[PDB]
């Protein structure tokens, strides 16, 4: 059973913080009972232009904020 | 020094003399000659300060104290 | 002397299950066939697979190792894991009683 515990002594050694996290995680929903699929990082950038000049050409997976008028008058 | 402390024990109070000589020398490593240091009874956590500041100059300092405790293990050591 | 050469209960090892915190460095150790429950770890109170109520009653073979501290976290754990490392010997294996002042919270008592 050496070669078995050397595999998993270089495995866990080569393990990075995210699986690191990953794992603690997952640990923790299947001691509580969840399970542990759907667990499964934004490389976005965002900011909000106010009142941009109308010639402003849009983007994808852009968000206008509307002053939308009063539905009940 | 006061671990272990015998206040009718000629040797015990000696070692104050000895220390207060090696004080007198500008020793860092004045406490080093009480019995319950010296016999590993007690440590101090400045010696965790005083590593960090070794390695300032020793950056593998902190890296071997940690083989040394077993903290870190990399395969092979 | 030989001259240097100039050239060339049973328990299973395996690593902690439940690490306590990120960055806890895994140590293969001694470990128990299956996690013990949380009443077995004491020895103040009998449970049902045991009704001792101090070391004595537990007959250990070996000398044991008391420590004194105010409350049971990660650095208990890191006291704990080298004395249970797969390369001490399981024969001279020291029982370890944490004599604390407060009650240890299910986290620590899960990771040990
Ligand atoms: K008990
Ligand atoms: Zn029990």
Redesign the pocket.
């Known amino acids: 059973a050496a070669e078995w515990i050397s595999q998993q002594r270089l495995s866990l050694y080569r393990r990075s913080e995210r699986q690191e996290l990953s794992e603690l995680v997952k640990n923790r929903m299947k001691h509580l009972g969840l399970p542990t699929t759907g667990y499964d990082h934004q490389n976005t950038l965002s900011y909000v232009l106010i009142n941009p000049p109308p010639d402003t050409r849009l983007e994808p997976s852009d968000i206008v904020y509307l002053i939308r008028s009063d539905p009940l008058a | 020094r006061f671990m272990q402390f015998r206040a009718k024990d000629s040797y015990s109070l000696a070692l104050s003399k000895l220390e207060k000589r090696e004080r007198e020398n500008g020793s860092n490593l004045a406490f080093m000659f009480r019995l319950p240091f010296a016999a590993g009874r007690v440590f101090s956590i400045s010696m965790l300060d005083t590593l960090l500041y070794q390695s300032f100059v020793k950056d593998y300092m902190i890296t071997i104290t940690r083989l040394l405790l077993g903290l870190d293990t990399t395969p092979g050591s | 002397i030989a001259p240097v050469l100039e050239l060339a209960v049973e328990y299973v090892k395996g690593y902690p299950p439940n690490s306590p915190y990120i960055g806890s460095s895994p140590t293969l150790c001694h470990l128990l066939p299956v996690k013990a429950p949380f009443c ?1 770890l ?6 049902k697979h ?4 101090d070391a004595k009653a537990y007959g250990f073979k070996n000398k044991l190792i008391i420590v004194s501290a105010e409350t049971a976290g990660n650095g208990l754990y890191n006291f704990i894991v080298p004395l249970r490392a797969y390369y001490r010997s399981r024969k001279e294996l020291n029982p370890i009683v944490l004599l604390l002042d407060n009650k240890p919270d299910h986290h620590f008592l899960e990771a040990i």
């Not at chain 3, 004491?42 to 449970?47: E, M, Q, S, T």
């Not at chain 3, 045991?50 to 109520?53: G, V």
């Open positions: 077995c004491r020895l103040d109170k009998g449970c045991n009704s001792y109520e």
